[PDB]
Amino acid sequence: VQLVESGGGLVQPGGSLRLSCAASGFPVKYEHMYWYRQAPGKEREWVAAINSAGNETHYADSVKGRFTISRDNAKNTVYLQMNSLKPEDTAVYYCNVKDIGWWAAYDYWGQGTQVTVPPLVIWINGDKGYNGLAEVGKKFEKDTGIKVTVEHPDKLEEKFPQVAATGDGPDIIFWAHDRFGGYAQSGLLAEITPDKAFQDKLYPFTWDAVRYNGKLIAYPIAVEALSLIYNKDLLPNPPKTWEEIPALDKELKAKGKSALMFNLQEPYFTWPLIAADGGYAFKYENGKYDIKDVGVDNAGAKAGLTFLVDLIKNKHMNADTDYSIAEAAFNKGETAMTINGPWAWSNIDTSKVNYGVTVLPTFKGQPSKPFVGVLSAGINAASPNKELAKEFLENYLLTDEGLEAVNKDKPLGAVALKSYEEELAKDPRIAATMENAQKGEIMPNIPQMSAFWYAVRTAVINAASGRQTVDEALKDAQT
Amino acid sequence: GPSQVQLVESGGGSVQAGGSLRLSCAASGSISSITYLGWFRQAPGKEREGVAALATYYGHTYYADSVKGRFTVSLDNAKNTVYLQMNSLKPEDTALYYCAAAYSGIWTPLGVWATYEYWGQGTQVTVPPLVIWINGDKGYNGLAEVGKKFEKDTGIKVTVEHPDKLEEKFPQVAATGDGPDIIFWAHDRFGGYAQSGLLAEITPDKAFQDKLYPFTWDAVRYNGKLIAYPIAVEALSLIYNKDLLPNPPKTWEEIPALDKELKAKGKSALMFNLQEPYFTWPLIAADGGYAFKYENGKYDIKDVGVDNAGAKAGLTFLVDLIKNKHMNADTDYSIAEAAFNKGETAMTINGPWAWSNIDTSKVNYGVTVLPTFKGQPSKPFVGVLSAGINAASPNKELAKEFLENYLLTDEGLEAVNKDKPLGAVALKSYEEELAKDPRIAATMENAQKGEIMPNIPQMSAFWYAVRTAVINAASGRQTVDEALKDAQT
Amino acid sequence: TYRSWHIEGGQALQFPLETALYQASGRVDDAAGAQMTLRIDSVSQNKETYTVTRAAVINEYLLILTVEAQVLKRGEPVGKPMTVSVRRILDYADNEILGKQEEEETLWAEMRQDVAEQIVRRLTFLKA
Amino acid sequence: YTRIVADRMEGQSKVKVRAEGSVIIERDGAVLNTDWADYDQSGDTVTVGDRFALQQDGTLIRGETLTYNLDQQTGEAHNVRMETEQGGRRLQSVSRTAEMLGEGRYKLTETQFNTCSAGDAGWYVKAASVEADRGKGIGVAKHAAFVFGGVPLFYTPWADFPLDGNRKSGLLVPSVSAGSDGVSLSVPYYFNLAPNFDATFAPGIIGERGATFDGQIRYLRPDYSGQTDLTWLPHDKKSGRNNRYQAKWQHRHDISDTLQAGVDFNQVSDSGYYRDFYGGEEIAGNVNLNRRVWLDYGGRAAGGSLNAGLSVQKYQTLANQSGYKDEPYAIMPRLSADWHKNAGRAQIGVSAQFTRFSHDGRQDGSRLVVYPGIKWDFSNSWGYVRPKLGLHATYYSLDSFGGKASRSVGRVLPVVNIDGGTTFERNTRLFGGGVVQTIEPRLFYNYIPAKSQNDLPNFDSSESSFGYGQLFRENLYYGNDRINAANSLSTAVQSRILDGATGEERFRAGIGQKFYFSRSDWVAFASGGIGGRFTLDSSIHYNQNDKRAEHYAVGAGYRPAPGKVLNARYKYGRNEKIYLQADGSYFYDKLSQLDLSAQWPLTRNLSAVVRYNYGFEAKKPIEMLAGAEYKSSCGCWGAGVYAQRYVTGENTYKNAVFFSLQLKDLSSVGRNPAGRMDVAVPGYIPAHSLSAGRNKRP
């Protein structure tokens, strides 16, 4: 005799699947059928059984309401229908029949099928509080029985529109709101459905950041902006202006130190200087964001990029300096200043460096204009977990408990949640972040933002390295 | 007239983890031709049928399912008292033992089903678990885990304790009859345990001698006899808190100047116990102080470091720190260890065992070689983890095998090291891994500079005299040079 | 010589025996021991399970009726013991007990009649 | 006189007589051969030397001194090897010092006795003093250890034996030990209370359920005689119940020479007492248990044969495994009254009835039946005819009707049937060694008018089993509600092969098929045997123009010797109800079974018994068994181990194992599960007395 099952494969939690046990070699029409399962590396437990005609069924008390067993005496096949699947449902299922020998004493187990339902998949950047977000995932798992996994892949903002467009990826995607209109345009995001009572918990301009075609396409979590961060011991009175940083650096190199090191590889960090004297992304109305009218080739962008290039010429900065180099130098007390957002502060606390966080230096008497990001949580269109992703975002993360858990790992900035922001506003580092955010402007979310960021990254890196001049670089970025 | 009860449980068993004794339930007047009893095991909190059963006349005995080839009830009708001879006794068996004192019942191979007249008085068979005695300054918990695994193999319970004054207790107090089976302590006490006679000589196997370092074998050897086995070699190492100090001073002279800057801060640079002489010996050794002079075997008493001027000068440097308040007489090693975890003291002089407690605190810290004094590196006193067997306790044999293999293993050496570190080790394999690890590597260099303490009992008395002297120096009641002269005489 | 035959012993087969004799033109005279008489020691019957279905449910019984006998000829030891036996089968489905406890009665009556006739055949076959 | 064969005797006249040289003492009836002897006329004693080989009436005793007293026969010997014999049984004893007290009283110390003969005795009960007495059949045995093989298997400080055939009160009747779910053991303790009555408490354990206390009483009086078995067990360990039980009762009473009053009773706690810890015959007569009460009557002795009896019955029906029971009706009164008389040739048979069926799931309602039949008979010399003129008259009265059921009805159905058939006898077509071949035809024709009686409920009627005998019955539904309307001419022919010396049936055939006023069926059968071997029984039930066959069956069974049997039997049938599905509609399916049996000595001294009941409808055996029995010279073994794996529910199989140990002249035979394959003759010792035998004499 021989039994073979079929229908194993990967389905998300909240999915459905019906396994079939095609039996042959004996008169199945007269015997019970026992469905068993054995999780990988655990004890083999009972699931459910069927009567000869399918009239009577017994279910395990733990699987009641979620599973139903059916049988068919025309193909000698039985079916086990599963719905509302969960991470704990994964096992190897076995079709078992008893007392079928010449002496009514034999048993037979099939080759089995593999059913794996994986944990909730959150993606968030490697600079953010992913361990603090995994503690919110442990409290989700405790209450609901469904595991949450937080990952932090390289280039996740480019990785997401790849894998979501292949028909998989994470259940929930964290990034700044700028990328989300390109994802929404491609149909890669589910429409989120918070009630008015939930919307009133978050500041209304943070809802406008995650609005595209009049749709809410992500949950806003926190407001980010770059601040001037300084070592109070090396520099108790930091510079108000960019123009006095050369003079500061040659005093500090006599000490064996430097004035300023910050990430030059990402244009997000060099944008406050570029935009200070009238450089801009897209203009016109906020709704229009006139895509013909780009402000990277203007004299304001040229003046700001020239000053940055001049700092590199005169050895005050190095064109090689990335996030890791700048943070390493500042936290070791080798440089008096750095430019960074709220997330960086946690490593500076651990470094035991006496620092303040303050207003970005002025360029030509103009305030530096940082591009303000709202950290935003979209649900993938290919993630049918949705309802579980909604439950996690609204009722676990966007609470005082869930935001403090992430904030204690890496500070979020000025959080979207009114109740926890009123608690956090008291911090002088959040007050400095809010001032620089006000002096900046909010990023567009339009699909052209990825092409804009790629074009300005190119211009900044080529101008800094000397491969292009400032006017060559910004002309090619306008293209 | 058949209401009399005459079954007092005579005899007794007084054996340790393993042994054997004969116990009795005396009876008088009654004819024992039909009257017989079954021995009972009554643990404190349970009452049940026992491990044995005898029927009289034909004399067939059921025994119990629990006992196989262990205890045989034996006829003694010439004694009027019946006897149970135990064999391969174990601590699990400890309980109160009784007899069934029955008159009428059937006997089958399945069992003697008679349950009447339980007249047994009850005698507690006294059996303690296998015993180990040491002061766990170096926690015995890592060794106890190897010992608990050894206990599972021998099916014998284990007894050890976290105490004080063992160094004083094992040589003199044990002579009265206390002092359990095994020890891992300073060699100076080892001569004293041998003087008491509880300690017994241990012969290593040739393979074990190859595995252990030759210098460690010399340290355990006492009076030319290998009376001990070295688990490892212990040397004090300077410990500096990483947050308080980026780099520790490499000069002992620098430490008081660093302490003066710390005094303005309000945190003392170094806190350590001056009451222990082992703790204050690296400065003394740096200035040329020695436990003894001439050949290591000779251990000449007439030449002593305390008599030598250099040792007094090194102690004088330490009392200059006491006068600056850079060192505190009232501060103790326990207070200093707590201060290091707190961060109150930037650096401390402590034994290798202190590192594991700092690891439990999780405060950032580093282990470094002791700073050079007057151009000569500070040398910590070196103590060897010698091991021993007590003859009086009945299961003495277990200790000799346990020290040979379970107590001394490269993986086992790590097991005690995680519970409380033993610094450099005797096993060559762990020593190579320890050389890679920074904390022990600093201790290993310190150990090479340091000299092992003498194992002679006379040295132990001299060591106590130094301890009183270094307490006098710390208090300032007696001049350090006068106190060192008092230790010499 | 054996035309008129007397019967004694055995209460169950009292009517069918005289019936099957009176069929063959035989009179049963009371207290007439000259002609050879017939004596039945006892009549033994029982009812046991015969075949059960797949799910341990009764399907049919089995009915036996063993009768021992002995010719007397005015004396106890002389003669030869004859023992006959007949058996039938009773369909007993599951729950028709109210009708089966009453069908078994006529089934036993039929078996008694058949045993009587068979003993009478054996007796008249001895007349040769 | 007591003459001595010794040639020389040292003695003057009376004081002493010393005889040597293999002397004898006459003492008519008791030979006494010894080696030498001495006398001393002080207490009138006798000493019989050194060898002392006495032999009187089958008890060869070989002792040392045997100092008799011969005034009241007080003897005292040494190293006695007593071997008493008797008709059918015997005992052997090797004592250390025998005594004698007066008459029929011994004190036989330090013995080693058995009912077996000499040699490596397989078993013996070594003991100290055994004071066997004749005035009281209670032989105490101090410190007795039942040996078996070479190692003691038991021990006691005091034991008794029934030294004769009395009813031993207080004897713990043996033990019953055997099971699968545990090692369920039980030890009865019979304890007689009076000559008429004797309760027997039997405490017991099941090893998986708990502790049972199945005991019983059994009384007797001039008129009332009865038994009262029962069982009870506290909190169960495997099921979950706490107070399960069972009760039985017979109480066959007599009032005065005509009226019996019997109480047949049986009641279990739940619907799962059987099928849990009961045997393999719970299948039949144990799905619904009985509870009855009745009376009787008979006589009038003058042109009448009255009978009666007011039965009161209410069955108890069990569930199968999930709570699906049919629960038939319940007869509260029943005033039966039968009749029978003879008018010379005609035979008047009258009847009557009454019954109120009480129920809940279905409607209630009394009824009444009067059936005044009259059947004349005519058998001239060859063929018989027997008409009949009955009149069935039912009358219901059903109340509390839920739906459509007429409140009051009444019917009359004149029954007229004419049974009768000739008979032929022939000798020319014999097949054998001198047999006689009888061929016999017969007919039947019953007329019963029709009515519309399907609105009346079905209280107790049921369709009869269709076989050969069915053709000659005047009612298909063998009950009282449904009486079919028939006009048929059942036609039959049956042939019996009768021996040429006696009239024992060797083979019987037959076939018949009832017409209509056609065929719609066929019925044949054949059952016989050539003696002990080649026995055969068969049947068939054919129906034409419709299908192949309804319910054919076949049989066999050949006995080569008194044992060595190999019985086998088939059975087929389509649309046979199986297992009572949830609603109440029985699962209908077709049967195909073939049970095989055997009891074939596998070795000179080891026999075997095997049963196997296969089912082709599902390819799984229903029941199967396997045993093994043994024998030896002294009944040393008499050991039987029997293992059976039956079926209990639709799927729940439940196996079991059994043991049986037998010793010669002290054991009992009969403890078996049920009546298995036909003969199953036991293959070990009779073992009648069950203890200590019956005889003890010098």
From TrEMBL, chain A:
<dbReference type="GO" id="GO:0055052">
    <property type="term" value="C:ATP-binding cassette (ABC) transporter complex, substrate-binding subunit-containing"/>
</dbReference>
<dbReference type="GO" id="GO:0015768">
    <property type="term" value="P:maltose transport"/>
</dbReference>
<keyword id="KW-0732">Signal</keyword>
<keyword id="KW-0813">Transport</keyword>
<dbReference type="GO" id="GO:1901982">
    <property type="term" value="F:maltose binding"/>
</dbReference>
<keyword id="KW-0574">Periplasm</keyword>
<keyword id="KW-0762">Sugar transport</keyword>
<dbReference type="GO" id="GO:0015144">
    <property type="term" value="F:carbohydrate transmembrane transporter activity"/>
</dbReference>
<protein>
    <recommendedName>
        <fullName>Maltodextrin-binding protein</fullName>
    </recommendedName>
</protein>
<dbReference type="GO" id="GO:0042597">
    <property type="term" value="C:periplasmic space"/>
</dbReference>
<comment type="similarity">
    <text>Belongs to the bacterial solute-binding protein 1 family.</text>
</comment>
<dbReference type="GO" id="GO:0042956">
    <property type="term" value="P:maltodextrin transmembrane transport"/>
</dbReference>
